[PDB]
Ligand binder design. Structure first.
Ligand SMILES: C[C@H]1O[C@H](O[C@H]2[C@H](O)[C@@H](O)[C@@H](O[C@H]3[C@H](O)[C@@H](O)[C@H](O)O[C@@H]3CO)O[C@@H]2CO)[C@H](O)[C@@H](O)[C@@H]1N[C@H]1C=C(CO)[C@@H](O)[C@H](O)[C@H]1O
Length: 1025
C-alpha cells in the first residue's frame, strides 16, 4: 500500500531557493476561474479551475476549501490537494479537533462569519474585525472594518488574452513536478506602508557586517539540516567562490514556514498578520528577493517541493505583532484536551531555567577513574570548578561520552562512582546522574534516534529489539536506489552512519516513526535512563543528522568535501546529510496511510521524534523518573508546534561576535514562531581560531556572550572539547576557567537567578496565553523608532511582559553601544550591580543615545516604571541550584518606581516540577499584585487567580524610593495587623531572624522591606501611610 495517491516523484535532491521559481510562470498552474461548491459549517468549497499560466487552454479542476478558523482571532485558512482527495493530517501543529473546539466555543458565543456566496459566485465572509471577499479567479482582498484598509491581497499575473490568473494558488503541472506555491502583493517599498516581514525560525541574515532581525526582501527555505556553523559548505549557492558566511538562503535546524507581516509600523493605522504554510516537505518563503530572479521586489510568496496545499492567515484579536503570535498558538492549542495548564505549550520544570554546563569530551564521572589522555576532563572537575567558585550552577549536559561505545540509552563504567554499570539505586555505585543529584544538580543527557549496528558481536538490546519487531526504516525505494549494506544487516534495513569527527563514528539503524508500536517502543527505552537518575532530555542529531554519503560509496565513506556542486550536481546520489531522499518511510503526517519517500515530509522527522519522547517517554514513564516527576526536552530540530514537547537550542554555533548577534535574533524570531524556550550555546559550540583550533573563547567575548543570554530562556554553556581521544575542539570554556572575568561572569548568573520567577512566570504566560517570552522591539506599539533598534533590542518580563528591556553589547572589545529607550514610558538602569545599591534617576523613554557607555562589567538592561518583579534570594546568602531551592529562600515582590502612580506584577507558583500535579490537577497559583499612590497613602494589593499551591515561607514587598513610614497596615483574610519596625538592620538578618510583620528601612538600597507571613500571599491590602 505504498504511495496510495499515484504520485510520480520528479524531485528528490535539495533545491536551493535559486532553483525555486514560481514567479517563473512556466509549467505552473494558477486559479483562472471558479463556480461555488457549497458550505457546511465554516468550510466553504470553491470548485476552482487551474490554468497553465503559459498556455491557458490547458485546464484542470480541483476543489479549494476556504475555512474560517477563528472569528474572534481573525484567522482563516485555504487548502486544496491537487494530487488527490483533501486530507486532514493526524499528526502536526494544527489538528482537526482543536479547530473544531475553537469553532464550537465561538458558536456558543454566537459568532457569525456569515460565510456566504454573492449572486456572482464570489465568496464573502467576516471575522471579528476583518471582512474578506474572494472572486472568481480566487483574487483575494482582506479589508479591515474600522478604517476600510486593505491589509492583505494576493497577486495576479495577466496573460495574452485569457483573463487574469491568481498566483494566490499555484501547483506545477504534475507532468513536470509536484511543487506548490502562493503569492501576495508585498508593500515593502510602499512609501507609507513600508511592509516588513518577520519570523522564519532560525534563519540568519547578514547586512554589511551585522546580523539582523528582519526577514524582508530575501529568499529563504525550510529544509532541516545538520548545519554546523549555520554555513555548511554543501549548502552554498551554485558556483560560490570563497568562504560561505551564514545567511538567509541557508536553511537551519528548525522548520518554520511562517511569516509575520508588519506594515504602517508604529502608528494609528498599523496592521499585522501571520502566514503559515503548513507543509513539511522542503518549503520556501520569499519576501521579494530578486537574487537569482527567484522573486520580484513587490511580491512575496511561500511554496513547497510537494503537497498538499494548506495555508493559514492569522491576523489576531487586536493590536500588535505579539497578538499574531498568541492567536497562532491558539490554533495549535490543547484547549480541546481540557489542558488545565498546558494550553499553548508544556511547562518545563523550574530547573530548566538555571545554568548548565555541557561538555563534548568528558571521559569519566570522577577523577579517580579518568583514563589518561591529553586534556581529558571529568565531570567531577567541572562541578568542582563551578561549585567551589560559588557559581549559581544547575548541573550538566552529559554527552555521548557517557554512552557505551556510542550506544544510545546506556552508560559505560567510567561514568559511575565505582567504575562499573549498575542497575542503579546502589549507594556504593552511583551513576553520573545520581552523584549529580547528591551535589544538588540535575542533568539532561544526549539522545539521538541512532541505534548502533556495527556491534562487533557484542550484545546491544536496543538495536536487537528493533530488528525483532521490524521497527526500523527499510531500504525500499520507488527508484531501485541502493543505499548501501554492511555485514551486520539486516538485509532490508536502511543503514546510515554517524560521524562526530576525529574517527568517532558508527553504522546505525533508525525508527520508522510512521509505524504504530514504534512510539511505544521508543518511549519505553528512556526507562533505562530514568531509573538511573536522568532528569531531562537532550534530543540531538534529529534530522536525522547522518554523515554525508554518495550512493555507491561504502557506508563509512563520505564524498569529497566539495561534492556535490553546480558543476557536478547530486543527481539523486547525495544523502544531504540524512536518509537518502528516496527512502520509503511510513507516513508521519497521515496515519495508516502507506509509505512515501522522505523527501515529502523531511521537515517532520524531528517533530515526530520529539512527540514520541514526550508522550511515550517522559509522560507515560513519569513513574520511573526519580527526583522530579515533570521533565522537559531540549531539542536541536523540529517543526512548528514542537513547543508542546519542550524547547530548543540552536545547534552548532561558534565563538565570534556574529554568533552572539545571531543567537539573539534567533531567540527573538523563535519566540514569535511559538518556540519561546530556546537559546543558543553560550560561548559558542565549535572552535574558531584558524591558526590553532584549540584556542578557547576570549574572556571579553565570554562576558558579552553570557550578558546577552543570561536572560534568554535556555541558558547553557556547551562546547566541543579537544581531548586526545577526539582531535577537534577547544581546550576549555567553563565559566570558572576565566580568572580575570570570574566576578563579572558569576554576578550575571546570580542576577538571572534572582529573576528566575520572572522567567518561570513568563513561561506560564506562554502556556496559558501563548505570549512570547522574548519580545521583538517591533512588538512595543506606537513607537516609530523600535524597528531600527530591533536587531539587538528586545523585551521581556513583568505582568504584561514588556517590563524589562535588554540591549546587550554585541561586539568583542567594545565599551559602548547605540541605545534606544522605547517611548511613552520611563526606564531604569538595572543589572547585577543594582540589587545592593539605589537606583539611578529615571531615563525618559523615547531617547536615542549614541555611544551609551557600557564597561565590560555591565550590560544594558532596564526595568520600566510600573514593574513589580518576583525575585528570589537564598536564605544563607550563598549560590545554590534552583532545583534545591525551597520555600524558605525568600520570595520578593520588588516594587519599582511608579508609572502614572500605578505598578503591577504577576507570579506563577508551583512545586517546581517535583511532581506533575500542576499540569495534571491544576495545583498551581497565580498571584497578582498592584500598587497605587494616592496623596499620602500607597496601597499594595495582593489578590490571586487561584491559590492551589501554598507557598510555604514568608515573602516580602520591596518598595523602591519610599523610605521610613508613619504606619503600615496589613489587611488579610486572617489579618488586621499593624506592622512594627523590625529590629534587624541587615537584609540578611531580616530574612533569617526577622519577625513576620517586620518592616526594615534599607538606607543602603533606598528601599523599604516588608516581611509578611506565607498565608497573606493570596489576598491582602497593605496600606503605607
Ligand atoms: C560534533 C558535531 O559532529 C558533526 O560536525 C562535523 C561537521 O558536520 C563537519 O562539517 C566538520 O566541521 C568542520 C567544518 O568542516 C569546517 O569548515 C569548520 O571550520 O570546522 C568544523 C569543525 O569545527 O566536522 C564536524 C565535527 O568536528 C555533526 O554533524 C554535528 O551535528 C555535531 N554536533 C552535534 C554532536 C554532539 C555530540 O553528541 C553535540 O555535542 C552537539 O550538541 C551537536 O550539535
Amino acid at each position: 500500500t505504498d504511495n496510495p495517491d499515484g504520485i510520480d516523484y520528479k524531485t528528490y535532491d535539495y533545491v536551493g531557493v535559486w532553483g525555486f521559481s514560481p514567479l517563473s510562470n512556466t509549467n505552473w498552474f494558477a486559479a483562472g476561474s471558479s463556480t461555488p461548491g457549497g458550505i457546511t459549517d465554516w468550510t466553504a468549497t470553491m470548485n476552482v479551475n487551474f490554468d497553465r499560466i503559459d498556455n491557458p487552454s490547458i485546464t484542470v479542476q480541483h476543489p479549494v476549501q476556504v475555512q474560517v478558523t477563528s472569528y474572534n482571532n481573525n484567522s482563516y485558512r485555504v487548502r486544496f490537494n491537487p494530487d488527490g482527495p483533501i486530507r486532514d493530517v493526524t499528526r502536526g501543529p494544527i489538528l482537526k479537533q482543536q479547530l473544531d473546539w475553537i469553532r464550537t466555543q465561538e458558536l456558543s458565543e454566537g459568532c457569525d462569519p456569515g460565510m456566504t456566496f454573492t449572486s456572482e459566485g464570489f465568496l464573502t465572509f467576516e471575522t471579528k474585525d476583518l471582512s474578506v471577499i474572494i472572486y472568481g479567479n480566487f483574487k483575494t482582498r482582506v479589508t479591515r472594518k474600522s478604517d476600510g484598509k486593505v491589509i492583505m491581497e494576493n497577486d495576479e499575473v495577466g496573460t495574452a488574452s485569457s483573463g487574469n490568473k491568481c498566483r494566490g494558488l499555484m501547483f506545477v503541472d504534475r507532468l513536470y513536478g509536484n511543487a506548490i506555491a502562493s503569492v501576495n502583493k508585498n508593500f515593502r517599498n510602499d512609501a507609507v506602508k513600508q511592509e516588513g516581514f518577520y519570523g522564519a525560525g532560525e534563519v540568519n541574515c547578514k547586512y554589511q557586517d551585522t546580523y539582523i532581525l528582519e526577514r524582508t526582501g530575501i529568499a529563504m527555505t525550510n529544509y532541516n539540516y545538520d548545519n554546523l556553523n549555520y554555513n555548511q559548505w554543501d549548502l552554498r549557492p551554485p558556483h560560490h567562490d570563497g568562504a560561505l558566511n551564514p545567511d538567509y538562503y541557508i536553511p537551519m535546524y528548525y522548520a518554520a514556514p511562517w511569516l509575520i507581516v508588519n506594515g504602517c509600523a508604529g502608528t494609528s493605522e498599523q496592521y499585522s498578520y501571520g502566514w503559515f504554510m503548513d507543509n513539511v516537505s522542503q518549503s520556501y518563503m520569499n519576501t521579494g528577493d530578486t537574487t537569482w530572479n527567484s522573486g520580484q521586489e513587490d511580491l512575496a510568496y511561500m511554496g513547497a517541493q510537494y503537497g498538499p496545499f494548506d495555508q493559514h492567515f492569522v491576523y489576531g484579536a487586536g493590536g500588535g505583532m505579539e497578538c499574531v503570535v498568541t492567536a497562532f498558538s491558539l490554533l495549535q492549542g490543547k484547549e480541546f484536551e481540557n489542558q488545565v495548564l498546558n494550553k499553548r505549550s508544556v511547562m518545563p520544570p523550574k530547573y530548566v531555567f538555571g545554568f548548565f554546563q555541557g561538555v563534548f569530551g568528558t571521559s569519566s564521572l570522577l577523577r579517580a577513574h579518568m583514563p589518561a589522555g591529553e586534556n581529558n576532563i571529568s565531570v567531577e572537575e567541572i562541578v568542582e570548578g563551578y561549585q567551589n567558585n560559588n557559581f549559581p550552577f544547575e548541573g550538566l549536559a552529559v554527552d555521548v561520552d557517557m554512552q557505551d561505545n556510542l550506544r544510545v540509552f546506556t552508560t559505560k563504567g567510567e561514568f559511575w562512582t565505582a567504575n562499573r554499570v549498575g542497575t542503579g539505586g546502589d549507594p556504593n555505585n552511583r551513576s553520573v546522574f545520581e552523584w549529580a543529584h547528591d551535589k544538588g544538580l540535575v542533568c539532561q543527557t544526549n539522545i539521538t534516534c541512532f541505534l548502533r549496528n556495527d556491534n562487533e558481536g557484542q550484545d546491544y538490546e536496543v538495536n536487537q529489539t528493533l530488528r525483532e519487531r521490524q521497527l526500523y526504516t527499510k531500504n525500499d525505494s520507488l527508484t531501485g536506489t541502493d543505499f548501501g549494506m554492511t555485514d551486520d544487516g539486516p538485509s532490508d534495513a536502511y543503514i546510515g552512519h554517524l560521524d562526530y569527527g576525529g574517527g568517532v563514528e558508527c553504522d546505525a539503524l533508525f525508527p520508522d516513526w510512521g509505524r504504530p508500536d514504534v512510539a511505544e517502543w521508543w518511549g519505553n527505552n528512556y526507562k533505562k535512563l530514568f531509573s538511573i537518575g536522568l532528569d531531562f532530555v537532550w534530543q540531538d542529531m534529529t534530522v536525522p543528522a547522518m554523515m554525508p554519503h554518495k550512493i555507491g560509496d561504502d557506508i563509512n565513506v563520505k564524498p569529497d568535501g566539495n561534492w556535490p556542486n553546480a558543476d557536478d550536481p547530486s543527481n539523486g546520489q547525495y544523502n544531504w546529510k540524512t536518509y537518502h531522499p528516496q527512502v520509503l518511510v511510513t507516513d508521519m503526517r497521515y496515519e495508516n496511510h502507506g509509505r512515501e519517500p522522505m523527501v515529502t515530509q523531511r521537515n517532520i522527522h524531528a517533530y515526530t521524534l520529539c512527540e514520541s519522547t514526550r508522550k511515550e517517554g517522559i509522560v507515560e514513564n513519569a513513574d520511573t523518573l526519580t527526583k522530579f516527576r515533570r521533565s522537559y526536552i531540549i531539542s536541536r530540530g523540529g517543526y512548528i508546534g514542537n513547543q508542546h514537547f519542550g524547547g530548543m537550542w540552536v545547534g552548532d554555533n561558534s565563538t565570534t561576535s556574529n554568533y552572539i548577534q545571531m543567537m539573539i535574533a534567533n531567540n527573538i524570531n523563535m519566540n514569535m514562531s511559538c518556540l519561546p524556550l530556546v537559546g543558543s550555546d553560550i560561548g559558542g559550540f565549535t572552535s574558531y581560531d584558524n591558526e590553532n583550533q584549540r584556542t578557547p573563547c576570549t574572556g571579553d567575548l565570554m562576558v558579552r556572550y553570557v550578558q546577552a543570554g543570561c536572560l534568554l530562556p535556555w541558558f547553557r554553556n556547551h562546547y566541543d572539547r579537544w581531548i586526545e581521544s577526539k582531535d577537534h575542539g577547544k581546550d576549555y570554556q567553563e565559566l570558572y576557567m576565566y580568572p580575570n572575568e570570574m566576578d563579572t561572569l558569576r554576578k550575571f548568573v546570580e542576577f538571572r537567578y534572582r529573576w528566575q520567577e520572572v522567567l518561570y512566570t513568563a513561561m506560564y504566560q506562554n502556556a496559558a496565553f501563548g505570549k512570547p517570552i522574548i519580545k521583538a522591539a517591533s512588538m512595543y506599539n506606537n513607537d516609530s523608532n523600535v524597528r531600527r533598534a530591533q536587531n539587538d533590542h528586545f523585551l521581556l518580563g513583568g505582568h504584561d511582559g514588556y517590563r524589562i528591556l535588554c540591549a546587550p553589547v554585541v561586539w568583542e572589545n567594545s565599551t559602548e553601544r547605540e541605545l534606544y529607550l522605547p517611548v511613552l514610558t520611563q526606564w531604569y538602569k538595572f543589572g547585577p550591580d543594582f540589587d545592593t545599591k539605589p537606583l539611578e534617576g529615571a531615563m525618559n523613554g523615547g531617547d536615542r543615545i549614541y555611544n551609551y557607555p557600557v564597561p565590560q562589567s555591565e550590560s544594558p538592561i532596564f526595568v520600566r516604571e510600573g514593574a513589580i518583579l518576583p525575585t528570589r534570594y537564598t536564605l544563607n546568602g550563598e549560590n545554590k541550584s534552583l532545583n534545591t531551592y525551597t520555600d524558605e529562600d525568600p520570595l520578593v515582590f520588588e516594587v519599582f518606581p511608579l508609572g502614572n502612580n500605578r505598578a503591577d506584577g504577576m507570579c506563577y507558583l508551583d512545586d517546581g516540577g517535583v511532581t506533575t500535579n500542576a499540569e495534571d490537577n491544576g495545583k498551581f497559583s497565580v498571584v497578582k499584585v498592584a500598587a497605587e499612590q494616592d496623596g499620602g497613602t500607597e496601597t499594595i494589593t495582593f489578590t490571586n487567580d487561584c491559590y492551589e499551591y501554598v507557598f510555604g515561607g514568608p515573602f516580602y514587598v520591596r518598595v523602591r524610593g519610599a523610605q521610613s513610614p508613619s504606619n503600615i497596615h496589613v489587611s488579610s483574610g486572617a489579618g488586621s495587623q499593624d506592622m512594627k519596625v523590625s529590629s534587624a538592620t541587615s537584609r540578611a538578618a531580616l530574612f533569617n531572624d526577622g519577625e513576620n510583620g517586620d518592616f526594615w528601612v534599607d538606607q543602603e538600597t533606598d528601599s523599604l522591606w516588608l516581611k509578611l507571613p506565607n498565608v497573606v500571599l493570596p489576598d491582602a491590602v497593605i496600606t503605607i501611610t
